[PDB]
């Protein structure tokens, strides 16, 4: 449901081919929040339950609303947590293709983590999806040090966080359809582009 720790719980002897690491939005529950489960179900349909590991960013990431105001759009502790998960994935399953995503503060967290990641691991992330990207204007719709072709940003018209502010308006909560269709569609396509079929 809202909590998935497939990477942490997973057996190194039976690694999935695809590992998805996702960061929830502010004040959301579990480690997947409102959008994560929808993406997860569709990834499982495409790759099979044993084919993909779903891992939310929990631990030190409290998804505290106020942290949106910090320099990187989230806390240092949260970035360390997500970096640690990418590092665990790389160590536990060196041959798995990685994919990532984040919503709202989670999108800033995903961008900050990916920017700080060792390039060898970052290069294994075949595609990243960002919803209501809080640093969209500041980063010109990109994740620093990460290719534009592997990035997909979903920023609704009227979602003020996509236009340089931290005001939360109704369009910020209208990413449901994207999480159910185009976001997993993009992730699946990017994984198949490099893994083949």
């Amino acid at each position: 449901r809202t909590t998935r720790d497939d990477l942490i719980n997973g057996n190194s002897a039976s690694c999935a081919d695809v590992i998805f690491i996702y960061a929830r939005g502010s004040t959301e529950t579990g480690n997947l929040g409102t959008l994560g489960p929808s993406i997860a179900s569709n990834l499982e349909s495409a790759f099979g339950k044993d084919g993909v590991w779903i891992q939310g960013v929990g631990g030190a990431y409290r998804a505290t609303l106020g942290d949106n105001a910090l320099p990187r759009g989230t806390s240092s502790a949260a970035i360390r947590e997500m970096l640690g998960l990418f590092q665990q994935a790389n160590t536990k399953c060196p041959d798995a293709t990685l994919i990532a995503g984040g919503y709202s503060q989670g999108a800033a967290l995903a961008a900050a983590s990916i920017e700080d990641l060792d390039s060898a691991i970052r290069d294994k992330i075949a595609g990243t999806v960002l919803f209501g990207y809080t640093k969209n204007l500041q980063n010109r719709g990109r994740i620093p040090n990460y290719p534009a072709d592997r990035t997909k940003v979903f920023c609704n018209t009227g979602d003020l966080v996509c236009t340089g502010s931290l005001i939360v308006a109704a369009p910020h909560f209208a990413y449901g359809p994207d999480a159910r269709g185009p976001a997993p569609e993009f992730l699946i396509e990017k994984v198949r582009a490099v893994r083949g079929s």
Side-chain angles (χ1 to χ4, degrees):
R1 203 174 198 99
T2 49
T3 293
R4 289 291 289 276
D5 286 296
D6 294 357
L7 169 63
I8 294 177
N9 293 336
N11 275 100
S12 352
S14 49
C15 280
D17 292 334
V18 186
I19 300 173
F20 178 59
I21 300 170
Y22 180 84
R24 70 193 190 286
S26 292
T27 332
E28 293 198 317
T29 63
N31 61 194
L32 297 184
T34 65
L35 309 181
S38 292
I39 302 168
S41 300
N42 286 298
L43 291 180
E44 293 171 349
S45 287
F47 306 116
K49 278 279 194 178
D50 300 88
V52 58
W53 277 356
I54 307 300
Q55 178 63 241
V57 179
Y61 181 40
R62 315 269 64 110
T64 297
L65 185 70
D67 291 347
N68 282 290
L70 292 177
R72 309 189 73 183
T74 190
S75 70
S76 293
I79 293 168
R80 182 156 291 202
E81 184 73 41
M82 193 169 195
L83 280 172
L85 289 172
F86 279 121
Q87 290 173 334
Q88 286 177 51
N90 183 65
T91 301
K92 204 164 197 190
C93 307
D95 299 321
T97 299
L98 310 179
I99 33 166
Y103 164 51
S104 194
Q105 181 177 165
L109 172 54
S113 291
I114 291 174
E115 177 183 12
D116 294 358
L117 250 190
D118 149 49
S119 62
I121 304 175
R122 179 199 300 132
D123 291 343
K124 293 181 172 192
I125 309 170
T128 300
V129 290
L130 302 174
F131 307 89
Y133 185 27
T134 61
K135 292 297 187 192
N136 180 246
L137 184 68
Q138 298 89 332
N139 286 344
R140 292 301 115 71
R142 296 282 299 273
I143 292 178
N145 298 329
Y146 188 73
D149 55 284
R150 288 184 178 198
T151 308
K152 189 162 184 65
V153 178
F154 293 96
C155 259
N156 285 333
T157 302
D159 184 355
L160 305 173
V161 304
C162 291
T163 210
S165 102
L166 286 180
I167 302 309
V168 175
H172 193 58
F173 301 100
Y175 292 105
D178 289 323
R180 297 190 281 276
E185 180 178 343
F186 177 79
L187 293 177
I188 295 162
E189 174 192 303
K190 292 295 163 180
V191 168
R192 290 181 175 148
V194 298
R195 292 194 71 88
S197 200

